[PDB]
Each structure stands twice: as structure tokens, then as C-alpha cells.
Amino acid sequence: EPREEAGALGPAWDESQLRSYSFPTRPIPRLSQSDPRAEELIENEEPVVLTDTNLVYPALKWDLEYLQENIGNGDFSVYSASTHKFLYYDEKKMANFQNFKPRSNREEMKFHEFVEKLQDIQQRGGEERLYLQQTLNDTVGRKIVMDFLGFNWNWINKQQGKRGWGQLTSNLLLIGMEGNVTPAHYDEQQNFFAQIKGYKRCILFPPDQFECLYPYPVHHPCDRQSQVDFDNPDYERFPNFQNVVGYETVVGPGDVLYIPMYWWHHIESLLNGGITITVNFWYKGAPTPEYPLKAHQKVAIMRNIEKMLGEALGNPQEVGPLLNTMIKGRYN
Amino acid sequence: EPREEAGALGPAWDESQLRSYSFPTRPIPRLSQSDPRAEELIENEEPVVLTDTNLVYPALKWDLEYLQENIGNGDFSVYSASTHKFLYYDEKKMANFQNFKPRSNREEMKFHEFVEKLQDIQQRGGEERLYLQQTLNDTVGRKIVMDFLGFNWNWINKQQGKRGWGQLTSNLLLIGMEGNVTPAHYDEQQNFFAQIKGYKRCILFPPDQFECLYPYPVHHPCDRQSQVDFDNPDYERFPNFQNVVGYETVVGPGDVLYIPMYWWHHIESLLNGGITITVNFWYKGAPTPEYPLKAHQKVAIMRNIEKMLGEALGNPQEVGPLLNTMIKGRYN
Ligand SMILES: Oc1cccc2cccnc12
Ligand SMILES: Oc1cccc2cccnc12
Numbered sequence: 001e002p003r004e005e006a007g008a009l010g011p012a013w014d015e016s017q018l019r020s021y022s023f024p025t026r027p028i029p030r031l032s033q034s035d036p037r038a039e040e041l042i043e044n045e046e047p048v049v050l051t052d053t054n055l056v057y058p059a060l061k062w063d064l065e066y067l068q069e070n071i072g073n074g075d076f077s078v079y080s081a082s083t084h085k086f087l088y089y090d091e092k093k094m095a096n097f098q099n100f101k102p103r104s105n106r107e108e109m110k111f112h113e114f115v116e117k118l119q120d121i122q123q124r125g126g127e128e129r130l131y132l133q134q135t136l137n138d139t140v141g142r143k144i145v146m147d148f149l150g151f152n153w154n155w156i157n158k159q160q161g162k163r164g165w166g167q168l169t170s171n172l173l174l175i176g177m178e179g180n181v182t183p184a185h186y187d188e189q190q191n192f193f194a195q196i197k198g199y200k201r202c203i204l205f206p207p208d209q210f211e212c213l214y215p216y217p218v219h220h221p222c223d224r225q226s227q228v229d230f231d232n233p234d235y236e237r238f239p240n241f242q243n244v245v246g247y248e249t250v251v252g253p254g255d256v257l258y259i260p261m262y263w264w265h266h267i268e269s270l271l272n273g274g275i276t277i278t279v280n281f282w283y284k285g286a287p288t289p290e291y292p293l294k295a296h297q298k299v300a301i302m303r304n305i306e307k308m309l310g311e312a313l314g315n316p317q318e319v320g321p322l323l324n325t326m327i328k329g330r331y332n
Numbered sequence: 333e334p335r336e337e338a339g340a341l342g343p344a345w346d347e348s349q350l351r352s353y354s355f356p357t358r359p360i361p362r363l364s365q366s367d368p369r370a371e372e373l374i375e376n377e378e379p380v381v382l383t384d385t386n387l388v389y390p391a392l393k394w395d396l397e398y399l400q401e402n403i404g405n406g407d408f409s410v411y412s413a414s415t416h417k418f419l420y421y422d423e424k425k426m427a428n429f430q431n432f433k434p435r436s437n438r439e440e441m442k443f444h445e446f447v448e449k450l451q452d453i454q455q456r457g458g459e460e461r462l463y464l465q466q467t468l469n470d471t472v473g474r475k476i477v478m479d480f481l482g483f484n485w486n487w488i489n490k491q492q493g494k495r496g497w498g499q500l501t502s503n504l505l506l507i508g509m510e511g512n513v514t515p516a517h518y519d520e521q522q523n524f525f526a527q528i529k530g531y532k533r534c535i536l537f538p539p540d541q542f543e544c545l546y547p548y549p550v551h552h553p554c555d556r557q558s559q560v561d562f563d564n565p566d567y568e569r570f571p572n573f574q575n576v577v578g579y580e581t582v583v584g585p586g587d588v589l590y591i592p593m594y595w596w597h598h599i600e601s602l603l604n605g606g607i608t609i610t611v612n613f614w615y616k617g618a619p620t621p622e623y624p625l626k627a628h629q630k631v632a633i634m635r636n637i638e639k640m641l642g643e644a645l646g647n648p649q650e651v652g653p654l655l656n657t658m659i660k661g662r663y664n
């Protein structure tokens with residue numbers, strides 16, 4: 001049910017701008033940050049949209065023009081795709097899987113190159129799509145450093161304190177095109193997804209839906225991603241997908257989404273929605289200290305077994321045959 | 333093809349005294365110990381029957397009478413069964429598997445009690461069967477210590493030296509009844525199976541037949557045993573049994589069988605064959621020092637993964653569901 005923007009500027013978005021999927025979804029709670037319930041949620045590692053942090057307030061002003069202007073002259077990683085879906089991958093890991101067909105491409109460039117590449121498609125009607133996953137470092141102009149300095153550190157630092165989370169680990173700035181999709185994957189890191197321009201729809205799944213979501217083997221370059229194509233799910237291969245239940249939200253300018261450690265997420269810039277900008281902050285979580293075991297700990301466990309079997313056997317291609325040898329007629 | 337005993341005392345045994353099984357078998361080499369080929373085999377961890385060690389020569393004289401006589405007055409573990417097959421189990425592990433039905437029974441007693449229990453069945457025609465797995469310790473009479481002192485230590489110690497095997501770990505003395513069966517299992521220890529009275533047929537399988545043989549889960553009291561009932565194999569549950577190929581021999585008085593580390597064995601006192609006596613020596617093997625990986629190392633690996641998952645999860649009942657969660661639609 002689309003939110004209504006102030007001054008009767010109309011409905012923020014509508015259903016037809018959302019992709020359609022086979023699984024059902026519940027809504028993520030949208031709270032104010034001084035609400036206790038939002039604090040409980042963050043401490044319980046459940047997701048929550050905070051509508052009023054002002055975390056990235058100075059950036060709320062950013063568009064394409066302002067940015068080409070002040071960002072500076074440094075290198076920006078620009079990923080490139082062949083469809084709407086943007087399957088990232090780990091470079092170090094291609095050696096493990098010899099006949100691996102990459103559907104994405106990283107290209108370094110300068111902001112304005114990107115901006116033309118994008119204005120071209122805007123004026124010529126092309127199929128191709130772009131994203132800009134580029135970390136934030138020192139190569140940024142005066143006015144952008146200003147902006148950054150205007151972020152709600154007090155708030156974000158105090159949220160780190162009270163949870164015992166470790167250090168801030170990076171700052172991705174992201175800009176992409178209407179319709180773009182990032183497919184379900186999970187990170188091991190606590191995350192604050194801070195929306196700036198355009199609307200994104202985030203679908204999340206708790207760690208304990210591990211078995212309906214089918215992660216690539218740990219050694220595969222697509223590690224941590226889900227193998228199920230959401231637009232076209234193969235229920236013979238992935239029958240437990242049929243049991244998957246999401247948590248959904250649409251975030252827009254000002255909203256901050258807490259994606260907790262280990263939660264799957266799947267992310268779509270709305271169709272017809274125009275360009276998008278987001279900044280996320282990633283924290284490494286509080287180090288481990290207790291049974292029953294929490295789902296994400298079982299995930300941590302599986303990852304390890306799979307890693308070890310990789311060293312021990314001398315060859316990640318044998319992980320699978322060894323695990324099958326172990327279970328057939330033994331544990332299944 | 334039964335061996336022919338000296339003085340034309342006739343054929344040592346014949347086919348009809350062997351049980352019948354679905355799998356095929358090749359013969360284990362029968363060598364003399366001064367033959368190089370037998371040395372190669374022992375160094376290569378392949379099995380070999382040595383016909384001429386004299387290892388237990390003084391004991392070749394042992395029967396039931398001589399033994400009730402001189403053995404002394406100590407405690408002898410006597411295991412008791414309900415059919416021909418004698419499924420042993422680990423006591424410590426029953427806690428792991430709540431509804432576990434034990435088909436065997438250990439009973440402490442004194443040699444003569446055993447000897448009556450056995451002479452009774454011999455005179456009354458009963459079904460029940462007995463074994464006597466009893467380790468060798470100090471509670472043995474003068475003439476038995478004599479006998480023991482007469483073993484070919486020089487030989488057996490020199491075989492330990494040249495292989496770098498660790499210490500002698502025990503000495504089982506075993507006596508059992510015609511027809512008795514010990515079902516396929518594997519030990520982690522190098523072993524010399526030294527035959528004294530009666531004939532046994534040993535069927536062995538190399539470590540790499542792990543997947544046709546289906547060991548119980550590591551935490552199960554029957555750990556290290558094979559789940560397939562050889563008299564009645566369930567090919568729907570155990571389809572890779574259909575691919576199993578054994579190494580077979582029949583050992584009699586004087587023959588010494590080297591069962592190498594990790595090799596399955598299945599052992600039957602011949603039918604109509606009378607009582608049997610065997611002494612085995614167990615050595616812990618040379619500690620680990622290289623890829624390709626040898627099958628028994630993969631076995632060592634699987635055991636470990638299964639153990640860890642037991643500590644980590646806090647509960648051996650969850651090992652199986654975790655491993656299934658790990659592979660389904662991921663590695664299978
Ligand atoms: O973990 C990530 C890495 C790069 C891009 C992302 C976009 C949306 C959510 N997570 C993301
Ligand atoms: O490892 C063993 C333990 C107790 C009895 C056995 C009888 C035959 C072969 N191995 C055995």
C-alpha cells in the first residue's frame with residue numbers, strides 16, 4: 001500500500017512498479033528511531049526501517065548534476081549487465097570453477113563517462129544496464145566531504161556502541177538504473193541501508209530459510225548467492241523454495257533499512273522509477289561469546305565444514321563427492 | 333579350493349562349510365614370511381596370510397582341556413548371542429541413541445562356567461551361541477605365561493620396527509563356536525590375526541569400498557560396523573552394495589592374517605567346524621606425515637567432520653539434518 005508524499009505530490013509508487021514473485025511476504029516494521037520497538041528489533045537482529053534518522057540528510061540533496069560536479073576526478077567501479085539481474089562474483093574464486101560463464105562486467109571509469117553511458121541509453125532506448133558499487137575514499141571534492149561530515153555520526157556511532165558491534169568496515173555508494181535487480185544473497189556483516197534518491201524494494205529472508213534458498217557452494221565464485229532464479233524458479237531442483245516466506249519493504253529518500261547479519265536480501269530499483277542512490281554502512285558484528293544454537297550459527301558452521309574439506313582434500317571439486325559419500329544410506 | 337593336510341588327513345574344509353553371499357571375492361595371497369612379496373604387501377598395507385611365522389607355536393597345542401586347566405582363576409568377558417551374527421557395540425554411546433535394541437550380551441565369568449555353558453549346548457542341541465573376547469593380562473597361570481613367552485616376539489617386534497608402527501596395544505584371545513559370525517567392521521589399528529584352533533574364513537574389503545558398505549553414523553553404538561545385513565541385503569537402502577568385491581581367505585592353525593588399518597573384515601568360524609581359537613595382536617599405526625589422498629585418509633576425515641558437528645551442534649541427533657541441509661540442491 002503505497003505511501004502518500006507531503007503536499008499531495010501523489011502516491012510514492014504503485015504495485016505495477018514492483019516485480020511479481022511466487023512467494024508471499026510480510027511487511028518490515030517502519031519505525032521512528034526514538035521508538036523503543038525499533039531498538040528491540042535492532043538488538044534482536046530483526047530488520048526495521050527507521051524513517052527519521054537524518055543519517056544521510058545532507059545527501060538528500062544529491063542528484064546526477066550535483067554529483068558529476070563535486071565528486072572529484074577519482075576512479076569509480078562501474079558494473080555492467082546483460083539483463084535486469086546483476087549477478088556479482090568473487091574474482092579470487094574463478095580458478096576453483098573452470099567453466100564459469102560471467103554475466104556481469106566491472107569497468108573502471110570517471111563519473112562523467114558513466115553519466116554519458118547512462119544518458120545515451122536514456123536517449124537511444126537500449127536494453128543494457130549499469131550499477132555503480134564504489135566504496136567511499138579520500139578522492140572526493142570539498143563539498144562532498146562537507147556532506148559526508150554532515151551525516152548523523154552521533155546516531156550511527158551510538159548504535160554501534162550499544163550493540164557491541166565492531167568497527168565500521170566500509171561505505172558503499174550506489175547508483176543504478178530503473179528496473180535493476182540485485183539477487184538474493186547474504187552478508188556476514190550488520191548493515192544500514194540508507195536511501196537517498198529513488199525508491200527501492202527490499203525483500204528479506206531470515207537465516208533459517210537457508211534450506212529454501214539454496215546458496216551456491218562456498219567455493220563457487222557466486223558464494224553467498226542463491227541459485228534459484230526468482231523470475232523462473234525450478235521446483236524440481238529447488239523444491240523447498242515452495243516454502244519460502246519473505247519480509248518486504250519499499251525504501252525511499254531518508255528511510256534507513258537495518259539488514260541484520262546473515263539475512264538474505266533481494267533488491268529492486270522500481271520500474272519506471274528513475275535512477276537510484278543509496279549509501280550503506282557495514283559493521284563487523286559483535287564477536288561470539290549457548291544452546292539452543294541460533295540459525296546464523298548453524299550457517300557459520302556449514303561454511304566452515306565446507307572450507308576445511310577444501311584444504312584437507314586439496315581440491316574444492318571433491319567437497320561434494322565427499323559429502324555425498326558421507327550421507328548416502330548413512331544420514332538420509 | 334580346500335588345502336590338503338599332511339599325512340592325507342583329508343581336505344581341511346569344504347565349500348559347504350562356508351556361508352553363501354551375493355558378492356564375488358578374490359583370494360588373499362598366502363605367503364611364507366621370508367618371501368619378499370609378503371613384505372611388500374605389509375609395507376603397502378595390503379592383506380597377506382603368512383603360513384610360517386611360528387608366531388603362536390606354543391599355543392598350537394591349546395585345546396579346551398589344557399586351557400580350563402592352566403589359565404588360572406581370573407575374569408573372562410563372555411559375549412552371548414541370539415543368532416549366528418554377533419553384533420558388538422560401544423557402551424558409552426547408547427546414551428546418544430535412546431531406542432537402541434541390543435542383540436548381544438556381555439557376561440563376566442570363570443573359564444569352567446563358560447566350558448559347561450558350552451558343553452551343555454553341545455549335549456542338548458540348543459540354538460544360542462557364545463564368543464570369548466577376553467584381553468590378555470597378568471591373571472594367567474605359570475604354563476600359559478610359558479606359552480606366551482614362547483611366541484615369536486623376535487619376528488613380530490621386527491615387523492613393528494621396519495614399518496614404524498607404534499606400540500602393541502592389546503592381545504585378544506578368542507574362542508567361539510562353529511557357525512559363529514562377526515559382521516563386517518573396520519579397526520583403525522594394524523592387526524595380526526593369528527589362528528590356533530579350528531578354521532576361520534575371513535572376507536576383507538579395502539577402505540575405498542566405504543561407499544558400498546554403509547557404516548553406521550559415528551555416534552551410533554554400532555560405529556565402524558556396516559549396516560548391510562550380508563545374509564539379506566536391502567538393495568533399495570544400500571544400492572552400492574551391489575558393487576562390492578571382497579578379498580577372501582580361510583585361516584587355520586599356524587596361519588597369520590595381516591588385516592591392515594581401515595580394512596573392513598567379516599569373520600566366520602566354519603559350520604560343522606568345531607570350536608575356534610585365535611589370538612590377535614593390535615598395533616597403533618605409524619603417525620601421519622601428500623596428495624593424492626589415500627582412501628583411509630578420506631575415511632579419517634569423514635569421521636572427524638562427523639565428530640565436530642557433534643560437539644558444535646551440542647547434539648549427535650542433529651548431525652544428519654545439518655548434513656542434509658548442506659547438500660540438498662547444493663552438492664547432490
Ligand atoms: O551487499 C551488497 C553489495 C553490493 C551491492 C548491494 C546492493 C544492495 C544490497 N547489498 C549489496
Ligand atoms: O576387532 C575385533 C574385535 C573383537 C573380535 C574380533 C574378531 C575378529 C576380527 N576382529 C575382531
Ligand SMILES: [Fe+2]
Nearest residue numbers: 185186187265
Ligand atoms: Fe548485500
Ligand SMILES: [Fe+2]
Nearest residue numbers: 517518519597
Ligand atoms: Fe576387528
